Structure 1
Amino acid sequence: GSSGSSGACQIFVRNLPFDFTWKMLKDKFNECGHVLYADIKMENGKSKGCGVVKFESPEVAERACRMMNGMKLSGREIDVRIDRNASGPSSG
């Protein structure tokens, strides 16, 4: 158990193809449910290979996690997990 955000609808991704775009990232997680928020984190105009995906229901996310957990992308295993700290911007 935990005392974080009530309902894990958003998730996190890492180790994404340098070419991997937002559009693809979305439709990619769509398989699970209806993706709403989808973007690709970047630094000074440089892909980081990490993004996020938000769903309509909290249950879905919990699923998309494992469903995509270790999804060999273009020969690159990605790390999918549920985001517990999705409140506000995440950057120093």
Structure 2
Amino acid sequence: GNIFIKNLDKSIDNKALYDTFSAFGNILSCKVVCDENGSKGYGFVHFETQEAAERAIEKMNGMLLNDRKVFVGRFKS
């Protein structure tokens, strides 16, 4: 159950990403990808289950998160 999240507002850090996505399922790992300029505006969440991943896509893809609409889909780790 892995998802990508793109068009993440750059104020979203790891703890915030977890807080939002932990509603959907058991999060084993998550991260906001960063570089020397901070957040790269995308992130990944690893759910324990596939069902959780699909709930997250159903509920969050195309939805506002802070000041941007995010793109959420399945990723192969």
Asked if Structure 1 and Structure 2 have the same fold, meaning a TM-score greater than 0.5 normalized by the shorter chain, the answer is yes
Show structure 2 runs of 5+ residues with no match.
Answer: none
Q: Which residue of 2 aligns with 1:3?
A: none
Q: Which residue of 2 aligns with 1:71?
A: 63
1:1-92 aligned at under 5 Å gives the runs 9-83=1-75, 85-86=76-77
The structure with higher relative contact order (CA 8 Å, sep 6+) is: 2
Higher strand share: 2
Report the CA distance between 1:14 and its aligned residue: 0.8
The number of aligned residues is 77
Percent of pairs with identical residues: 38
Opposite residue 57 of structure 1, the aligned amino acid is: T
Give TM-score, length-normalised by structure 1: 0.76
Opposite residue 28 of structure 1, the aligned amino acid is: T
Structure 1: which 4+ aligned runs deviate by more than 6 Å?
none
Show structure 1 runs of 5+ residues with no match.
Answer: 1-8, 87-92
Matched residue SS, 1:80: strand
CA RMSD for the aligned pairs?
1.2
Give TM-score, length-normalised by structure 2: 0.89
